[PDB]
Amino acid sequence: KSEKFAFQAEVNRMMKLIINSLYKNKEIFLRELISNASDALDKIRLISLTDENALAGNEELTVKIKCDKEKNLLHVTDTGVGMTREELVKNLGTIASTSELIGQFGVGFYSAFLVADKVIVTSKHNNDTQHIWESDSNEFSVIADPRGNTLGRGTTITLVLKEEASDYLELDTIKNLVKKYSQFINFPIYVWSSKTKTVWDWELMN
Amino acid sequence: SEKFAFQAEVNRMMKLIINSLYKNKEIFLRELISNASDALDKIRLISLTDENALAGNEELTVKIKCDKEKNLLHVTDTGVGMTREELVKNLGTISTSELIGQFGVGFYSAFLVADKVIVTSKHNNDTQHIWESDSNEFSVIADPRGNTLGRGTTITLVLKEEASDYLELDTIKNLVKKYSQFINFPIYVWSSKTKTVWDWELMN
Ligand SMILES: COC1=C2C[C@@H](C)C[C@H](OC)[C@H](O)[C@@H](C)/C=C(\C)[C@H](OC(N)=O)[C@@H](OC)/C=C\C=C(/C)C(=O)NC(=CC1=O)C2=O
Ligand SMILES: COC1=C2C[C@@H](C)C[C@H](OC)[C@H](O)[C@@H](C)/C=C(\C)[C@H](OC(N)=O)[C@@H](OC)/C=C\C=C(/C)C(=O)NC(=CC1=O)C2=O
């Protein structure tokens, strides 16, 4: 189980706070994830200033959100700097209204457990191979992605939604939320939506 | 090397117990008394083949102590006890009311009323040690007070505010009785009588 890890005590306590104090406005997890994605794009953009190889694995700088209503999943993918394996283990397993306090203290990512029974973070960084981080909140593991490098560069956050969080699978909801929290993000944010013959394509939200 | 993490299974188990028994929480005492009884049963067996078994403490009892000022509830038995290695493994790894005793996870029902649970235990083959937890981790350290128990274990609960009622004597006596009526070992509750004096009171 050299791939299995446990959470630092403080993180456990922190996840417990978010759940007990934000259960009346769970929709903020989308805000927090879109915000994280945006900070990630800012860093690769900052890296491309000095390193001229920074953007060779994925020239674009976007944020695409997809709804798999059949597998009960919600995907949020950015083409930011991404995270190395060691960063998945250290930065997600430890740390150094409360709606505003979370993003400021650096723990807004855990707001995802407000609507998910399981969170998965797939990531490719310019200096490592693609890896997968998974957790149901009672432990977590990190393994090399057997699919190889399918992201180029960036991160995908996958949420296996709670049955009560089923509404986050309907497009009308996500679009409303994506739009409401995409307002001040300096990057384009699309949503895989239907157009009704009935064809699917990326739809710009901001 | 004094702070450990709970195994994933235990984590899952604590939540289940807490999510499903929030309606009948008084169960926690039944579970502690029951465990106390098992412990006593085991030292008694050992005393059959081991003449030195009861060297550290000749009695086979279970004593319950309420401390309102400090907000603590103590459950002490004089059974076989637990060695440091056992506290670590047997506690960190593994109506449903009567379904938890079966699986052997009753202990955790203590978190239904306690923000923090402490386990002090002295086992014939080791020195006294202390296991503490708030459910988000746990730690095991050598008791700096020495071999104070002689032999056995003390379950100390730092009761939640909404658990203020288990601090009241008449309540514990009432509860300790309903569940001690089946244990073949004497259960006492440090009670009081009005001058006002304190002394053990037999419940079964
Ligand atoms: C200031 O940076 C932020 C930090 C500090 C730190 C961990 C940054 C990280 O160092 C490895 C990378 O530099 C950064 C580019 C990676 C992301 C933003 C990831 O998101 C995507 N899309 O990559 C996010 O994944 C869930 C990382 C964990 C987030 C946590 C625990 C959180 O709750 N809040 C945080 C939000 C932040 O903005 C946070 O702690
Ligand atoms: C069958 O034995 C029981 C086990 C198996 C096992 C761990 C037994 C233990 O092995 C080291 C000792 O042999 C035994 C004498 C010690 C006690 C009963 C302790 O209580 C006192 N007073 O000593 C209790 O402390 C909280 C131990 C943890 C209890 C757990 C996790 C539980 O939830 N249920 C259990 C109840 C049991 O009866 C249980 O798992």
Question: Residue B11 is part of a domain; what is its CATH number?
Answer: 3.30.565.10
Question: Contact B118/B132 with Cβ under 8 angstroms?
Answer: yes
The number of residues in chain A equals 206
Residue type, A41: L
B77 assigned ligand-binding residue:
yes
Beta partners for A66? Answer: A75
Beta partners for B193? Answer: B197
Query: Number of structural domains, chain A?
Result: 1
Ligand 2: residues whose CB is within 6 Å?
A: B 35-36, 38-39, 42, 77, 79-80, 82, 86, 90-91, 104-107, 153
* Structure-token pair, residue B176: 């300790």
Beta partners for A149? Answer: none
B contacts of A4 (beta carbons < 8 Å): 8
Please state, in angstroms and rounded to a whole number, the distance separating the CA atoms of residues B194 and A186: 75
Alpha helices for B50-158 (secondary structure H): 84-92, 100-103
The count of other CB atoms within 10 Å of the CB of residue B75 is 23
Give the strand pairing for A189-195 and A4-5: unpaired
Please state, in angstroms and rounded to a whole number, the distance separating the CA atoms of residues A57 and A47: 14
Cα of B202 from ligand 2 centre, angstroms: 24
CB nearest B5 (choices: A6, A13, A16): A6
Does B16 reach chain A within 8 Å, measured CB to CB?
no
Please state, in angstroms and rounded to a whole number, the distance separating the CA atoms of residues A164 and A185: 29
Please state, in angstroms and rounded to a whole number, the distance separating the CA atoms of residues A176 and A144: 35
Strand, coil or helix: B148: coil
A25 assigned ligand-binding residue:
no
Cα of A206 from ligand 2 centre, angstroms: 59
Please state, in angstroms and rounded to a whole number, the distance separating the CA atoms of residues A50 and A54: 9
* Structure-token pair, residue A126: 């310019």
Which residues are CB-neighbours of A64 under 8 A, at least 6 positions away?
Answer: A77, A189, A190, A191, A192, A202
The burial of B36, by beta-carbon neighbours within 10 Å (0-12 exposed, 13-18 middle, 19 or more buried), is given as: buried
Range of the domain at A90: 1-206
* Pocket lining: A91 vs ligand 1, CB cutoff 6 Å: yes
Cα of A82 from ligand 1 centre, angstroms: 9
Q: Which residue has the tokens 């039944």?
A: B30
Does A16 reach chain B within 8 Å, measured CB to CB?
yes
Buried b (16+ CB within 10 A) or exposed e, A169-186: beeeebbebbeebbeebe
* Pocket lining: A77 vs ligand 1, CB cutoff 6 Å: no
Method used to obtain the model: X-ray
Residue type, B176: V
Concatenate the DSSP letters of all residues of chain A into one string.
Answer: -TTEE---HHHHHHHHHHHHHHTT-TTHHHHHHHHHHHHHHHHHHHHHHH-TTTTSS-----EEEEEETTTTEEEEEE-SS---HHHHHHHHH-----HHHHHHHT-GGGGGGGTEEEEEEEEE-TTS--EEEEE-SS-EEEEE-TT-S-SSSEEEEEEEE-GGGGGGGSHHHHHHHHHHHHTT-SS-EEEEEEE---EEEEEE--
Does A138 reach chain B within 8 Å, measured CB to CB?
yes
* Structure-token pair, residue A79: 């083409």
Question: Contact A120/A134 with Cβ under 8 angstroms?
Answer: yes
* Structure-token pair, residue A36: 């994280």
A91 assigned ligand-binding residue:
yes
Please state, in angstroms and rounded to a whole number, the distance separating the CA atoms of residues A149 and A123: 9
Q: Give the DSSP H/E element, type plus range, for residue B158.
A: strand B152-159
Resolution of the deposited coordinates, in angstroms?
2.3
Phi and psi of B3, rounded to 5°?
A: -115, 120
